Structure formats: structure tokens, C-alpha cells
């Protein structure tokens with residue numbers, strides 16, 4: 001299934017719930033600029049290898065485009081286009097002055113040296129310099145890409161630009177020593193926690209002493225469980241990893257679980273906790289369920305058996321549309337995927353603002369601003385949810401597309 005057509009059909013379904021002109025829909029169905037470049041690097045053996053690089057700028061009506069760079073051997077142009085289109089709505093739903101962008105290189109970085117990786121980053125910057133900038137396109141870390149590559153890319157951009165502007169702001173996710181921002185590591189989990197708290201407030205239930213189950217125990221899952229336990233005061237009763245999962249009705253300590261995961265390679269066989277399966281964790285009777293793992297964990301097969309009141313989609317699309325219908329009929333409030341995990345891009349926006357201004361904030365200021373942004377975005381989505389009597393995902397899509405459409409109309413791009 002083409003990832004581009006899928007995004008287009010998603011956009012058409014969103015447009016079905018709102019009044020949008022056909023010309024605007026056709027404009028939004030096509031990326032405004034796609035750049036495909038050859039990335040030649042010198043290998044350690046002395047030969048010269050050429051890679052394929054992409055940089056798709058879907059739409060920049062609201063401002064400079066934003067999006068990460070992927071280094072995956074299976075990366076395709078359609079994937080970049082779909083992810084840029086997705087990023088447009090992600091930055092629109094949280095009200096950032098940003099557009100949609102995405103980049104990628106068809107490369108297997110598992111078999112590249114550090115010097116070869118640096119050469120790849122610098123050559124990619126040299127290839128795509130003409131379409132990126134602090135006010136044109138801001139790349140970001142993504143799968144198989146880390147802040148080290150961001151530092152290399154920023155250095156190359158600064159070298160090419162001859163320091164004629166804010167070279168720090170050309171890219172986000174940089175190391176703290178060079179234009180980095182505080183709060184980047186726990187951005188996604190913090191945004192998810194804020195959305196969960198706002199959802200609980202909307203449903204009129206307090207989270208003090210409640211039960212939360214988290215699927216996937218990576219950076220997002222671990223920090224979600226932790227931040228829940230401290231800030232929200234909830235009782236983490238179950239966590240899981242690809243290998244397996246564990247359950248304990250008396251609660252779990254996220255630090256100890258992470259220590260055991262980092263020692264034995266998995267969260268399995270934790271003391272005082274019985275080993276369970278991922279599906280058993282999904283169907284556990286809790287108050288908040290936060291899948292932070294591979295996608296399509298909630299489908300038509302198991303959607304009816306879910307007992308959680310709040311499902312926070314920390315990961316990317318862990319629920320299939322039939323499962324959305326089943327859960328909405330069940331009365332379970334869902335937080336849309338690109339609204340729950342919008343903390344990372346918000347924190348990225350904050351880093352760009354700090355770089356542009358030349359003044360850097362503390363952890364408390366970043367946390368407070370992220371709280372405001374997430375609270376406002378969630379309440380807007382929930383108000384659309386109740387007013388239009390549609391699904392939460394549908395409301396988030398309506399809000400994002402409405403913002404982009406208004407920006408497009410104000411510029412005069414579309415006359416209707």
C-alpha cells in the first residue's frame with residue numbers, strides 16, 4: 001500500500017467532515033516542492049559511493065517547513081512525501097508557525113563508519129543547501145539519526161553560509177554545547193502526560209492513585225511511565241517490551257524496571273511481577289493505556305476487549321480505524337497519535353526559537369510553555385470533538401486542515 005495514497009485518502013476523509021474548497025483540497029494533496037539529490041561520499045576504502053537523498057516540503061503557508069531526516073535502507077520518495085504531509089497536520093494541530101517537511105537518505109547506517117556518517121551528513125547538506133534554512137526548512141533527528149548527525153549538519157551549513165545568519169536555527173535536536181535546548185529528551189513523554197492530564201480533567205476523573213499500563217519500554221515508554229508516576233501520581237501497574245511484559249497490581253518503579261531491562265536485556269522476570277504478554281497488557285483493566293511501541297497494536301481483533309478509559313497514542317498510529325470506531329462506541333476517549341506525541345515537535349520549535357533569538361531558556365520555562373501548548377491544542381481538539389460529534393482523530397484532522405486552509409486563504413494562494 002502506497003504511503004502517499006494512504007495519506008491522501010486520510011486527507012480526503014478529513015475534508016469530508018469540513019467545508020473546504022476543491023481547489024484547496026487539490027493543493028493540499030500535492031507537496032509544494034520535492035527535491036531529489038545525489039549524495040556522493042568518499043568511503044573508507046577510497047572509493048566513491050553515491051546515495052539518493054530526499055527533501056520534501058509539503059506546504060509552507062503557515063511558515064517554514066519542519067521535519068526530520070531518515071537514514072533507512074528501505075526509505076522511498078513516497079514515504080518522505082507521506083511523512084511530510086503528516087508533519088504538516090502535526091505542526092498545525094499544535095499551532096506552530098511551521099509547515100510540513102521531511103527528508104531521507106536511502107542508506108544502511110548500521111554498516112557505515114563514524115567518518116563515513118559525517119561525510120554523508122555533510123554531503124547531504126551540500127546537496128540540499130539551496131532548499132533549507134532557518135526560515136525555509138528546518139531538519140530534525142529521526143529514525144537512525146541522532147543529535148551527533150545534527151551537529152555535523154549544522155556545522156556544514158554554517159560553513160557554507162559563511163556565518164551570515166542564525167546557523168544554529170537551521171536544524172533542531174542539536175547537542176546542548178551547540179545551540180541545543182533543554183527538555184528535548186523527555187519532550188514526547190511530557191506532552192503525552194499533559195494530554196493525559198487534560199483528558200482526565202475533561203472526563204472529570206482524578207488520576208491520583210489510578211492505574212496506567214504502558215506498552216513498549218523505550219525512551220518514550222519509560223519516560224511516560226516515570227512522568228506519570230511522579231507528576232500524575234498514577235500507579236504504573238504494567239509495562240512491556242517486544243520481548244515480553246510484566247504485571248503487578250501493587251505498582252512498579254520505572255527506574256528499577258529500566259535498570260533490570262538494561263542489565264538482563266528485557267523487562268521480563270522482574271521481581272514481584274508476573275510475566276505476561278503484550279496482548280494481555282493491552283486488555284488489562286486500567287484507567288489510562290499508553291501504547292508507546294510498534295504500530296497497529298489495537299485492531300478489530302482486540303478493540304472490543306479493551307477496558308481502559310483513556311487510550312493515549314504515544315506511538316505513531318497504534319489503532320486501526322475500525323478499532324477507533326469500536327473504542328468510540330465503547331465510550332473510551334482516544335487521544336489522537338499526532339496530538340499526543342506533539343511534544344517533541346513543540347520542543348523542537350522551542351529550540352528553533354531559542355536559536356533564532358540567541359537567548360536560551362531553562363528547563364522550567366520549556367516545561368511551562370510545553371504545558372500551555374499541549375493544553376491549548378488538546379482542548380481545541382476536544383471542543384471540536386464535542387461540537388462536531390465526530391471522532392477525536394477526525395477532530396484533530398479538522399483543526400489542522402482548517403488552520404492550514406485559513407493560512408492558505410489569507411496568503412491568496414486559493415481564492416475560494
Ligand SMILES: NC(=O)C1=CN([C@@H]2O[C@H](COP(=O)(O)OP(=O)(O)OC[C@H]3O[C@@H](n4cnc5c(N)ncnc54)[C@H](OP(=O)(O)O)[C@@H]3O)[C@@H](O)[C@H]2O)C=CC1
Pocket residue numbers: 188215216217218219220221240241242243266278292293294295314315316341344
Ligand atoms: N523516537 C521519538 O523521538 C518519538 C517516537 N514516536 C513514536 O513512538 C514509538 C516509540 O518511540 P521510541 O521511544 O523511539 O521507540 P524505541 O525505538 O526507543 O524503543 C522501542 C520500544 O518499543 C518496544 N517494541 C518494539 N516492537 C514491539 C512490539 N512488537 N511489541 C511490544 N514492544 C515493542 C521495544 O522493546 P525492546 O526494548 O525489547 O526493543 C522498546 O521498548 C514509535 O512508534 C515512534 O514512531 C513519536 C514521537 C517521537
Ligand SMILES: O=C(O)CCC(=O)C(=O)O
Pocket residue numbers: 066067068087139140141142172344345348
Ligand atoms: O521534531 C521534528 O521537528 C520532526 C520529527 C518528527 O518527524 C516527529 O516528531 O514525528
